[PDB]
């Protein structure tokens, strides 16, 4: 009861660690006991690597079952295998003019071409887009309305040490679940790869509660809910370096140093079990993994960086967006109709995603095709080749045509698509316009090699009778650097990328173009999509990036001030049990500064409102601060500074302690208060 | 002048923040006024890089001649390129009954085989090792008592705010980079790798003097100091990765996280430039890079973890033995002679290393020569072999016979000749001992396949006509077993393995090798031997893995106690300079925390002696504390803690803030002091 946090109320990281090191003692000490006590201090003492385990494992099968539903009912969207049902488009058209796989059309219509066909799978596609959508938000409307968004700003702020109760419980890990896979399926612009750190989390936190040591505690379960999110990175795109670097740079708070080889672990084993969910034999790493085997040039090297700033542009565009039309689905009527701008959004992706091939093709999906440079066999529009490079012809000219128009529906769409109450991620969407932007920017450049070979760019670097430009690496560079530019990650990015698509022979044009998108994007700001929904959702978030500039003291930001009512303190004996009831009743606050008399003001200690309203209430049921005696409660060292303090100091103390409240006194006397809102009130 | 810090004392981090952060205000501010200000702020930004850029060149190329050096020196101890001096062994009978490669004995007596050339060349080795022995510490007494000893404790110590003036200047590193080169040539039971770790740092701290952001702040030369640690871990293993763990692990104290890229950055062009010193087209790694194809069973991992408890017995036993020498080298007229010390221990291990080759035989080149398993054309006494297993014979019983005394007379020489003074480390003598005991227990694991393949154990793993037994692998396991062992390493030992030794294959025995040694260890005492170094040397470090179990608030801790002297407090206006210079004059306090007046006892602020000192001679060339006015000095902000508070919190403010010293009070009361150095003692 006493010591229970509220709801949307941050942590006292120190008094976490103050009790974990008063159950430790405890524990330690029952420990020379007998035998039996040894053995339960070992396994206390694994309890955290049991954790870790566990949700990796979780990890990789939620993961696992994601990936198979999506890629069924993604192509359930478009026909379905008649031979066996549980079969999608891959399975049933390569496992044996395939009389298995039929569409709609010969369904309804009874003729696999016509115009009559066309028109008539167009509707179905669209209809099942809407159906899938509408489940999806219907779905998470009514049991779990936390599933929605990628939830990796509130699993940030989660590990800040703010709260959220059933933003990582059991109803939200199922809803989340089913409605990625219903929305990841609804042709929506939006990824389940990001939205995979969050039901990571939801898995760890739900298994913090098999462990009196994680359930009871609020820091041990930050440890695991950051292990959970390396474990969820690694699961999304199968890099557990990356994964772990991501937890370090964007969403960890408090790292220990010790969690390192917990996070690592998570993330290994949620990579080992997501590989060992093959059950048809996949060799694809991940659904997007692609190889590289090519070489690229210094020349080469220009355009990398003209991606950089392309998807340094856009990422800032999208942060200058996306927020701007967020706030105003906020606060507008737009914010009381989720389901029917859900709906609205999923007709018009259908409608405008079927006549596109590439649009039409799911977008993770669509970024493995972009990847992957042209093949002998290949005779798609992508590739449609009529010296050392392949001809051209006019399939090759309006594959940009078209290609150019995907990018621009899916930049415009995910703006829109991005915040919306159904679980979306900004991780494929993002790679997808990264992607044709780099495999326009590839083949306009091959183009140029083919025609203007004669000039010394490429007289020199390109071999003669041998392909030089590598649409594919070009691809991947526009992904990395919109990534980047839109996440404003630097080297968990450019290992995420790494290790999604083995070689070292591109981290030079990775790291140029992941450094250059974030150069441009911190030129029109420098928070990244995270820190900008952070912001906007108003989560008290304490971002170290963020520079005190302002020279201010502890004076300034202390309150009450002048205007703001007396500072409320308590006493020790003149006070009585009504007193307190009635100015508890009276005031919003959490807590008590404690001195002796009025006119004394000297700082005893502090007590918390939640504290003293459990422990007034059991003593009713079943005043003397100093040795109703409540001093059991009381906080004896509450942390003080002096009012010439620089809040750069004040807000490092709540950086690194994790302090929730600082009072301030001068030279010896209480004067004011400063909560971890306060400061950022200040800042605001 | 104000603000610098003396010998031996440690850092008040929150201070050097605070002014880092007053340089950024005002070069931020000046950067406003035109286009050179905005240059000279690139400039400063982009100074964080440069020292690093400059550090890992410097690193790569001292470690390239170093190495280059001691390979010419240890091979001038055996014989001479009469063709071309500047060769050694390897070059010198490669580069074509070698005619140009003479040893001493055909020389000096004219034959080059009979007893008396055997004698001769015995004495001769003798000689030229006792001559770069004593050379070396002659050299490191008369010119630079720094560059004695790993330097590994004491760059930890001085990345925990310590200061030790020279440790790290340029006489201390021309003078660790001679005498390096004389003692790894001296034969003595020492390494290179780890003195590289202070080598490299000793660039560190000499380019920071090129910058004002470096030189005036210390905070910014411990991140630049934290850089060049790693640099210095990646130049002497070749590993990038491992060496920015070991900097996370085992030496860096404080990490802001981002220079995680700084370090990494060193650590990569430090492995470039070592690379790119190839004069002579060496295509191994490092001159102990040892490459695996072969597999494992799991059979094999139950010695791989017998090995993990020998290493970690050893480990602990050393330092069990190696301090309890230390002690008695430093209470006993042992430290009044270091020169005749080194001479003795150069002259014994010359004289029992010449008789058995693996002892003669340079322990880097032992180690390179453990690691490669037996070749089909390797017919040396390692490898004398006469179904899937060889044939053996006498010569793998000898081989086994001499190994054995190898091992020992590493382990009781390695014991002797650590703490010494001349540069000396604990890498290659460590990974020796384990290698020795890891291909011993190979060949017996192979001829015991061999002898007895027909029982389960072998008849099922080990294929017919095939050799399944790797000693190679178990010298490398047994490797990296004692070096954990030792120095208490888990995942950066590993991982510095891993890349030292390309290939994942053997990533399950390390790992179960290096756990089990450290958890063996841990049975005798659970601090590395550079910690166990940090201790007997008596530093001022704080180690974060120590838990202050005592149940002790700072009211136990802080100083005066009753039997101490009143607590040296200050006044407003009451005192004058005589005052304070007698207070100043006749106490060794380094600070001085300021009150109004005597009876009120209400805490103001802190002085510091060498700023009141410096303010003071200023003063008089050229007493108000409130608004001789000195409050200019004064510090507004001094921490103080409630005597209630439990000393956890303290030492966590410490251990996250970086402060030398916090006040203590009760209930708005000055009553007591703690620095950093007090709760060690209490510690103690
Ligand atoms: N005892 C007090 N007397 C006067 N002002 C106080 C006192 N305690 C807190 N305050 C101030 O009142 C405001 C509300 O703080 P409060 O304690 O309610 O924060 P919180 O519970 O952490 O936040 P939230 O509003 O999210 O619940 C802040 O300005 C805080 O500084
Ligand atoms: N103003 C003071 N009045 C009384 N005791 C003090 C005062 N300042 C420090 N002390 C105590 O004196 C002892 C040494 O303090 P001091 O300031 O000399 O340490 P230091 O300079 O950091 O250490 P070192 O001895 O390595 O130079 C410690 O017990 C410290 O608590
Ligand atoms: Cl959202
Ligand atoms: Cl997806
Ligand atoms: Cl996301
Ligand atoms: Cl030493
Ligand atoms: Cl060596
Ligand atoms: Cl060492």
Same mark, same amino acid.
């Given at each position: 009861?006493?010591?229970?946090?509220?709801?949307?109320?941050?942590?006292?990281?120190?008094?976490?660690?103050?009790?974990?090191?008063?159950?430790?003692?405890?524990?330690?000490?029952?420990?020379?006991?007998?035998?039996?006590?040894?053995?339960?201090?070992?396994?206390?003492?694994?309890?955290?690597?049991?954790?870790?385990?566990?949700?990796?494992?979780?990890?990789?099968?939620?993961?696992?079952?994601?990936?198979?539903?999506?890629?069924?009912?993604?192509?359930?969207?478009?026909?379905?295998?008649?031979?066996?049902?549980?079969?999608?488009?891959?399975?049933?058209?390569?496992?044996?003019?395939?009389?298995?796989?039929?569409?709609?059309?010969?369904?309804?219509?009874?003729?696999?071409?016509?115009?009559?066909?066309?028109?008539?799978?167009?509707?179905?596609?669209?209809?099942?887009?809407?159906?899938?959508?509408?489940?999806?938000?219907?779905?998470?409307?009514?049991?779990?309305?936390?599933?929605?968004?990628?939830?990796?700003?509130?699993?940030?702020?989660?590990?800040?040490?703010?709260?959220?109760?059933?933003?990582?419980?059991?109803?939200?890990?199922?809803?989340?679940?089913?409605?990625?896979?219903?929305?990841?399926?609804?042709?929506?612009?939006?990824?389940?790869?990001?939205?995979?750190?969050?039901?990571?989390?939801?898995?760890?936190?739900?298994?913090?509660?098999?462990?009196?040591?994680?359930?009871?505690?609020?820091?041990?379960?930050?440890?695991?809910?950051?292990?959970?999110?390396?474990?969820?990175?690694?699961?999304?795109?199968?890099?557990?370096?990356?994964?772990?670097?991501?937890?370090?740079?964007?969403?960890?708070?408090?790292?220990?140093?010790?969690?390192?080889?917990?996070?690592?672990?998570?993330?290994?084993?949620?990579?080992?079990?997501?590989?060992?969910?093959?059950?048809?034999?996949?060799?694809?790493?991940?659904? /997007?993994?692609?190889?590289?085997?090519?070489?690229?040039?210094?020349?080469?090297?220009?355009?990398?960086?003209?991606?950089?700033?392309?998807?340094?542009?856009?990422?800032?565009?999208?942060?200058?967006?996306?927020?701007?039309?967020?706030?105003?689905?906020?606060?507008?009527?737009?914010?009381?109709?989720?389901?029917?701008?859900?709906?609205?959004?999923?007709?018009?992706?259908?409608?405008?995603?079927?006549?596109?091939?590439?649009?039409?093709?799911?977008?993770?999906?669509?970024?493995?095709?972009? /990847?992957?440079?042209?093949?002998?066999?290949?005779?798609?529009?992508?590739?449609?080749?009529?010296?050392?490079?392949?001809?051209?012809?006019?399939?090759?000219?309006?594959?940009?045509?078209?290609?150019?128009?995907?990018?621009?529906?899916?930049?415009?769409?995910?703006?829109?698509?991005?915040?919306?109450?159904?679980?979306?991620?900004?991780?494929?969407?993002?790679?997808?316009?990264?992607?044709?932007?780099?495999?326009?920017?590839?083949?306009?450049?091959?183009?140029?090699?083919?025609?203007?070979?004669?000039?010394?760019?490429?007289?020199?670097?390109?071999?003669? #009778?041998?392909?030089?430009?590598?649409?594919?690496?070009?691809?991947?560079?526009?992904?990395?650097?919109?990534?980047? #530019?839109?996440?404003?990650?630097?080297?968990?990015?450019?290992?995420?990328?790494?290790?999604?698509?083995?070689?070292?022979?591109?981290?030079?044009?990775?790291?140029?173009?992941?450094?250059?998108?974030?150069?441009?994007?911190?030129? /029109?700001?420098?928070?990244?999509?995270?820190?900008?929904?952070?912001?906007?959702?108003?989560?008290?978030?304490?971002?170290?990036?963020?520079?005190?500039?302002?020279?201010?003291?502890?004076?300034?930001?202390?309150?009450?001030?002048?205007?703001?009512?007396?500072?409320?303190?308590?006493?020790?004996?003149?006070?009585?049990?009504?007193?307190?009831?009635?100015?508890?009743?009276?005031?919003?606050?959490?807590?008590?500064?404690?001195?002796?008399?009025?006119?004394?003001?000297?700082?005893?200690?502090?007590?918390?409102?939640?504290?003293?309203?459990?422990?007034?209430?059991?003593?009713?049921?079943?005043?003397?601060?100093?040795?109703?005696?409540?001093?059991?409660?009381?906080?004896?060292?509450?942390?003080?500074?002096?009012?010439?303090?620089?809040?750069?100091?004040?807000?490092?103390?709540?950086?690194?302690? #994790?302090?929730?409240?600082?009072?301030?006194?001068?030279?010896?006397?209480?004067?004011?208060?400063?909560?971890?809102?306060?400061?950022?009130?200040?800042?605001?």
């Amino acid at each position: 009861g006493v010591g229970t946090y509220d709801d949307f109320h941050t942590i006292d990281w120190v008094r976490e660690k103050c009790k974990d090191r008063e159950r430790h003692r405890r524990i330690n000490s029952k420990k020379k006991e007998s035998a039996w006590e040894m053995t339960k201090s070992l396994y206390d003492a694994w309890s955290g690597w049991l954790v870790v385990t566990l949700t990796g494992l979780a990890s990789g099968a939620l993961a696992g079952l994601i990936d198979i539903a999506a890629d069924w009912m993604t192509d359930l969207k478009e026909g379905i295998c008649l031979s066996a049902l549980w079969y999608n488009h891959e399975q049933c058209c390569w496992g044996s003019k395939c009389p298995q796989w039929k569409t709609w059309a010969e369904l309804i219509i009874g003729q696999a071409e016509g115009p009559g066909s066309y028109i008539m799978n167009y509707i179905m596609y669209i209809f099942w887009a809407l159906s899938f959508a509408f489940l999806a938000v219907s779905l998470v409307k009514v049991f779990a309305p936390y599933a929605c968004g990628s939830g990796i700003p509130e699993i940030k702020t989660i590990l800040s040490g703010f709260i959220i109760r059933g933003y990582l419980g059991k109803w939200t890990l199922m809803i989340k679940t089913i409605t990625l896979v219903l929305a990841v399926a609804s042709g929506l612009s939006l990824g389940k790869e990001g939205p995979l750190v969050h039901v990571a989390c939801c898995c760890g936190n739900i298994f913090s509660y098999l462990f009196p040591k994680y359930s009871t505690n609020e820091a041990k379960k930050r440890e695991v809910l950051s292990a959970a999110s390396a474990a969820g990175v690694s699961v999304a795109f199968g890099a557990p370096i990356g994964g772990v670097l991501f937890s370090l740079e964007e969403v960890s708070y408090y790292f220990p140093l010790k969690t390192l080889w917990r996070s690592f672990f998570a993330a290994l084993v949620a990579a080992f079990v997501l590989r060992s969910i093959n059950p048809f034999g996949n060799s694809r790493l991940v659904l /997007f993994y692609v190889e590289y085997h090519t070489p690229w040039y210094l020349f080469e090297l220009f355009p990398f960086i003209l991606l950089g700033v392309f998807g340094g542009l856009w990422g800032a565009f999208f942060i200058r967006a996306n927020i701007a039309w967020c706030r105003r689905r906020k606060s507008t009527k737009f914010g009381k109709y989720p389901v029917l701008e859900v709906i609205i959004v999923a007709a018009i992706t259908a409608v405008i995603a079927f006549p596109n091939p590439y649009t039409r093709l799911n977008t993770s999906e669509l970024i493995k095709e972009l /990847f992957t440079d042209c093949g002998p066999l290949e005779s798609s529009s992508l590739c449609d080749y009529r010296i050392p490079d392949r001809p051209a012809g006019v399939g090759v000219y309006s594959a940009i045509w078209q290609l150019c128009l995907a990018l621009i529906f899916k930049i415009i769409m995910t703006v829109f698509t991005f915040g919306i109450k159904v679980p979306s991620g900004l991780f494929i969407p993002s790679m997808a316009i990264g992607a044709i932007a780099g495999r326009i920017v590839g083949i306009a450049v091959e183009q140029l090699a083919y025609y203007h070979h004669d000039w010394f760019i490429f007289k020199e670097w390109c071999e003669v #009778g041998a392909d030089c430009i590598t649409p594919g690496l070009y691809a991947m560079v526009g992904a990395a650097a919109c990534l980047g #530019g839109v996440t404003r990650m630097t080297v968990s990015l450019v290992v995420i990328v790494f290790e999604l698509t083995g070689g070292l022979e591109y981290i030079v044009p990775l790291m140029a173009a992941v450094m250059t998108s974030k150069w441009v994007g911190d030129a /029109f700001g420098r928070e990244g999509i995270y820190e900008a929904h952070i912001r906007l959702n108003g989560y008290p978030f304490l971002d170290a990036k963020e520079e005190f500039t302002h020279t201010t003291l502890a004076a300034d930001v202390m309150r009450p001030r002048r205007s703001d009512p007396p500072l409320a303190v308590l006493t020790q004996d003149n006070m009585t049990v009504d007193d307190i009831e009635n100015m508890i009743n009276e005031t919003s606050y959490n807590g008590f500064p404690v001195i002796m008399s009025k006119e004394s003001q000297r700082l005893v200690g502090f007590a918390l409102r939640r504290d003293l309203t459990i422990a007034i209430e059991s003593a009713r049921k079943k005043v003397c601060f100093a040795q109703l005696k409540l001093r059991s409660i009381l906080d004896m060292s509450p942390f003080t500074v002096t009012d010439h303090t620089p809040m750069e100091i004040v807000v490092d103390i709540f950086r690194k302690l #994790g302090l929730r409240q600082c009072l301030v006194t001068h030279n010896g006397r209480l004067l004011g208060i400063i909560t971890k809102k306060d400061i950022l009130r200040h800042m605001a």
